[PDB]
Amino acid sequence: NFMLTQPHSVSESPGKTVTISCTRSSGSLANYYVQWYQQRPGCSPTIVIFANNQRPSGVPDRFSGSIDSSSNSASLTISGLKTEDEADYYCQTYDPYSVVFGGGTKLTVLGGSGGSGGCPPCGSGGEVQLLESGGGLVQPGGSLRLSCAASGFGFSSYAMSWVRQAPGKGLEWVSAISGSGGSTYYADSVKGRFTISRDNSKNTLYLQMNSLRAEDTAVYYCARDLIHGVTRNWGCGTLVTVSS
Amino acid sequence: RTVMVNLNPKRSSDYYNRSTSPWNLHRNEDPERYPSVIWEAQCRHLGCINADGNVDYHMNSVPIQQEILVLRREPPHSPNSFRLEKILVSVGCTCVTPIV
Ligand SMILES: [Cl-]
């Protein structure tokens, strides 16, 4: 479909402003909302900007987002940089059939230390709870079924998705399903092997993984989406290892 | 506890056509059920129609799924009274936005 290109890394001094840009290779960027995620080392990702420029409660107002339709790009801007802003920032958007993450931009706040951050909670806060399970070790060609138990919201009113991350690598969208379960979407490399489904009376999301491959090794996250392609909340992940 | 009891939407409504989240109507027939015909909404698009008439993926068409009362045949194929069941049906579609 398309790719999102953001720099591998950027550095800037504390107290200064930094902008991270993300260029979309194909399709018109202005047709689809752009999200930005912060992920500290060893933590789950958390939303900092959704729908191009919306800021959730709890995100400091030094974070802002914008889009530039003529260059087909979106930007995250951090004013008044603090050491706790040092992290990996991911852009994300979508088209009618797929969701795409950028490679992640690692932001270094020069000066070394003078702060920290800490990890977010599982479910991205509030009453929203997403608890993954089913991960384990499997042989190539094997099968595994992941489940995600949701609480704290009207589950059948929310599109849901699976996103995975191999330790030390980037976010990769896996699969998505509409609130009713009537529409499903798949990354190309998992089509014909993975099946996403949901049981709305049990508040549960499933991912059936057949024909497992070594490259399928990753932490797999459950995610609640406000619409297709706009992720608002993240689980804490379950680990899937595929090895001979 | 057994108790006694006696005796298309397009006809009067074209919201299915004029909604920013328009839908088609599926005829769901079941003679072993009363009412025999249920009309089930299927949203036409993932996105919603915007002010230019175009499908817009900044929002989604979503169905409104409701449990409703029906009457079925307690002994199958036997029209000698029946059970009272609840079924989940799409009654229409609305447009959901991430901006609230
Ligand atoms: Cl795809």
User: What are the boundaries of each domain within chain B?
Assistant: 9-96
Residue bearing tokens 């998705």: A161
Residue bearing tokens 């995610």: A223
Bridge partners, A131 (sequence order): A149
Question: Are B99 and A156 in contact (CB < 8 Å)?
Answer: no
Can you tell me whether residue B79 is helix, strand or coil? coil
Q: Which residues of B touch A183 (CB under 8 A)?
A: 46
| Peptide bond just before B76 cis, omega within 30 deg | no
- The helix (run of H) or strand (run of E) holding residue A197 is strand A194-199
DSSP structure class, residue A178: -
Specified resolution (Å): 2.2
Question: Are B63 and A180 in contact (CB < 8 Å)?
Answer: yes
Is the Cβ–Cβ distance between A174 and A195 less than 8 Å? Answer: no
Both tokens of A153, joined, read 């919201």
Q: Both ends of chain B: CA-CA distance in Å? A: 47
| Phi, psi (rounded to 5 degrees) for A229 | 90, 0
The residue type found at B28 is: N
Burial of residue A167, with CB atoms counted within 10 A of its CB: 0-12 exposed, 13-18 middle, 19 or more buried: exposed
Closest CA to A211 of A235, A195, A233: A195
> Per-domain residue ranges for chain A?
4-109, 129-242
Burial of residue A17, with CB atoms counted within 10 A of its CB: 0-12 exposed, 13-18 middle, 19 or more buried: exposed
Question: Are A229 and B62 in contact (CB < 8 Å)?
Answer: no
- CATH architecture assignment, domain B9-96: Ribbon (2.10)
| Phi, psi (rounded to 5 degrees) for A11 | -130, 145
Min Cα–Cα distance to chain B from A139, Å? 38
What length does chain A have?
244
Min Cα–Cα distance to chain A from B71, Å? 22
Query: What's the rounded Cα separation, in Å, for the pair A149 and A128?
Result: 11
| Backbone gaps in chain B, preceding residues (C–N over 2.5 A) | 7
Query: What's the rounded Cα separation, in Å, for the pair B96 and A91?
Result: 23
Query: What's the rounded Cα separation, in Å, for the pair A28 and A128?
Result: 32
Residue bearing tokens 């920290």: A116
What are the CA-CA distances from residue A95 to residues A51, A188, A227, A228 (Å)? 14, 14, 12, 9
The CATH classification number of A4-109 equals 2.60.40.10
DSSP assignments along chain A, one per residue: ---EE--SEEEE-TTS-EEEEEEESSS-GGGS--EEEEE-TTS--EEEEBTTTB--TTS-TTEEEEEETTTTEEEEEE-S--GGG-EEEEEEEE-SS-EEE---EEEEETTS-S----PPPTTSSTT-EEEEE---EE-TT--EEEEEEEESS-GGGSEEEEEEE-TTS--EEEEEE-TTS--EEE-GGGTTTEEEEEEGGGTEEEEEE-S--GGG-EEEEEEEEEETTEEEEE---EEEEE--
Is some CB atom of chain B closer than 8 A to the CB atom of A28? Answer: no
DSSP structure class, residue A200: G
Both tokens of A197, joined, read 């489904």
- The helix (run of H) or strand (run of E) holding residue B15 is helix B15-18
| Phi, psi (rounded to 5 degrees) for B68 | -130, 155
Query: What's the rounded Cα separation, in Å, for the pair A69 and A211?
Result: 41
Is some CB atom of chain A closer than 8 A to the CB atom of B58? Answer: yes
Question: Are B96 and A54 in contact (CB < 8 Å)?
Answer: no
- The helix (run of H) or strand (run of E) holding residue B17 is helix B15-18
The CATH classification number of A129-242 equals 2.60.40.10
Can you tell me whether residue B16 is helix, strand or coil? helix
CB atoms within 10 A of CB A56: 16
Domain A129-242 in the same topology as domain A4-109: yes
Bridge partners, A24 (sequence order): A4
Is some CB atom of chain B closer than 8 A to the CB atom of A69? Answer: no
∠B5-B8-B14 over CA atoms, to 5°? 130
Is the Cβ–Cβ distance between A121 and A147 less than 8 Å? Answer: no
Both tokens of B18, joined, read 């004029």
Query: What's the rounded Cα separation, in Å, for the pair A213 and A61?
Result: 42
What length does chain B have?
100
Bridge partners, A234 (sequence order): A223
